[PDB]
């Protein structure tokens, strides 16, 4: 139940740590707020 | 009576000219009211007109306001705005005008004027919408 075919289109996103919005994979700042803190979408549990 | 085809004309400039004619004393008929254009962004335009339509007296809705939803009446109301509606002179001028959607049989194959200082080739930016679009968004039968 790993399915890389599915991971490559579920988990190729970035998230802004101020506003929370999803952003395209190769970006530098957020669509909405202009913030520079963008992290990859969590592909494995953290914590 | 002067007959003006509104196809491709900027609404406010057209209305200014027409108001001056009505005040000078002429009878005017506008045809193809749905094909006149309004410049700018669709969201701002539609928001303005929807806000106009949801204005009413809180104590009695039979006392207005009565802002329009149809295209011919939008055009008529703009002209009215450009006149002295509170005086007898303005009321008589406003009675000298008629506006029509499309072209009715009675005006087929006739001389249609055009107002040069209203025309959209004059424009440069392509952000524009149509009065018919506005009417459809507001819910008017044309």
């Amino acid at each position: 139940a790993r399915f890389p075919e599915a991971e490559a289109r579920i988990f190729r996103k970035l998230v802004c740590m101020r506003c929370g919005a999803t952003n395209p994979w190769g970006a530098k700042k957020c669509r909405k707020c202009g913030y520079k803190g963008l992290r990859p979408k969590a592909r494995e549990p953290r914590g | 009576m002067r007959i003006i085809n509104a196809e491709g004309l900027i609404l406010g400039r057209l209305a200014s000219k027409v108001a001056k004619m009505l005040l000078e004393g002429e009878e005017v008929v506008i045809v193809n009211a749905e094909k006149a254009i309004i410049t700018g962004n669709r969201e701002d335009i539609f928001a303005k007109y929807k806000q106009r339509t949801e204005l009413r007296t809180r104590t009695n809705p039979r006392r207005g306001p009565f802002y329009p939803k149809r295209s011919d009446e939008i055009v008529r109301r703009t002209v009215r705005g450009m006149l002295p509606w509170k005086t007898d002179r303005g009321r008589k001028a406003f009675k000298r005008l008629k506006v029509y959607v499309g072209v009715p049989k009675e005006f087929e194959g006739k001389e249609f004027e055009t107002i040069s200082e209203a025309h959209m080739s004059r424009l440069a930016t392509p952000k524009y919408v149509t009065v018919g679009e506005v009417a459809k968004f507001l819910g008017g039968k044309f």
Binding site: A1, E5, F11 | -
Partner: protein, 183 residues
Amino acid sequence: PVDAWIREEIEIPEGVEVTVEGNTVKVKGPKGELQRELKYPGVQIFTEDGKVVIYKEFPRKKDVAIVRTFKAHINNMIKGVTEGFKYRLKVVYSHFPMTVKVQGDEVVIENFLGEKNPRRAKILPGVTVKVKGSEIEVEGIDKEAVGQTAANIEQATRITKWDRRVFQDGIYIVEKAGKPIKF
């Protein structure tokens, strides 16, 4: 401004014919006609020795971007009447094997996650769908139609309520007109 006469040029291939009349571009190849409206103030399109020329006379950055967008579109139309486009899709399931069928202008998916109700996806005019085992192919001439049909089929299988790490069943794109998808 950037320059004074930005001019882009596309060479026509063996058996293609481009008509340009009235902001409408028309392309004929071995297979099917294709039409497209491309208008912006100051931008002109016409034909040369063999070429399609797009031209503007004192451009700004945005105008440059638009000229090159139009060029991209014309090239895709030409490549499409010349060869065509084909996209590839793959099906995966943990439990509950899903049956995918083509009937009319809709694709039908049933037994998705155990659901009694079937999901449905539209097929736009002029696009062909084939199903070979665990794989789907979407082929045609219009790039936008082909991509839209494929995206319809992929969104017909979408989950909002449960964790997508564990729940991964669905239909996914793996290749868009040649270039494969990779993480």
